[PDB]
């Protein structure tokens, strides 16, 4: 029950997600490994499983995060509305939203019954971050809602260094209106009451979790070096 402009908006976003989200981590390679509290499971095509139980994992997670970040940069590049922005605003928008979009993508593979992010060949088994993931998962969002949340986060006009505030703001509003309309015309079950406003509030919480993590890593990198070159750029280190 959407306008064509809105129905098209979702198509570009969903096609971008399909083309840039390696959900199975099938192309994540040449990554560092612990010993070579998070538990890591590495599953081969044969069904064999290598399990790492912690006593060293930070290098691995830096490689995995950087892989996810590359997918998110690729996601932004394949969206028309992002590509048309000045490159400096593209850079500013990606610096401010990278962590958020990765967490949103990770939420789509999160199993709340096991506390495990099931990323195909890799699995991470187990903080306001955990709370976000359990609360977002409870909303039972569709792919369409996740990808619109990613767009609303990506096109945040208040990000440090953004120059075309109004262009970015008007784009965000159009994504938010499309999200609102999607839910009304495609989800009537009473479990999804106030779903649009609940999503908008989760995004505000993700904004605060992003702020707290950036400050933490900007301090930890001084002592223990682990950040990949791209992470150092994205987080201002």
């Amino acid at each position: 029950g959407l306008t064509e402009e809105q129905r098209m908006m979702i198509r570009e976003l969903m096609d971008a997600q399909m083309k840039t989200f390696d959900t199975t981590f099938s192309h994540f390679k040449n990554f560092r490994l612990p010993g070579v509290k998070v538990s890591l499971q590495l599953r081969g095509e044969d069904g064999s499983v290598w399990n790492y139980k912690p006593p060293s994992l930070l290098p691995h997670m830096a490689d995995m995060s950087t892989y996810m970040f590359k997918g998110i940069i690729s996601f932004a590049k394949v969206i028309s509305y992002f590509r048309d922005l000045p490159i400096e605003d593209q850079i500013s928008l990606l610096k401010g939203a990278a962590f958020e979009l990765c967490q949103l993508r990770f939420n789509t593979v999160f199993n709340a019954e096991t506390g495990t992010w099931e990323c195909g060949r890799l699995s991470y088994c187990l903080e306001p971050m955990l709370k976000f993931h359990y609360m977002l998962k409870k909303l039972q969002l569709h792919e369409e809602e996740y990808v619109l949340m990613q767009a609303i986060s990506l096109f945040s006009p208040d990000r440090p260094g953004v120059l075309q505030h109004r262009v970015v703001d008007q784009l965000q509003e159009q994504f938010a209106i499309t999200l609102k309309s999607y839910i009304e015309c495609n989800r009537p079950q009473p479990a999804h009451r106030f779903l649009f406003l609940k999503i908008m509030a989760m995004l505000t919480e993700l904004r605060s979790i992003n702020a707290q993590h950036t400050q933490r890593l900007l301090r930890i990198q001084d002592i223990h070096p682990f950040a990949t070159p791209l992470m150092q750029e994205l987080f201002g280190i």
Partner: peptide, 15 residues
């Protein structure tokens, strides 16, 4: 400004 401090990010956006 941002382009030189974000050479990898700029590279990934261009490719």
């Amino acid at each position: 400004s941002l382009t030189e401090r974000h050479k990898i990010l700029h590279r990934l956006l261009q490719e």
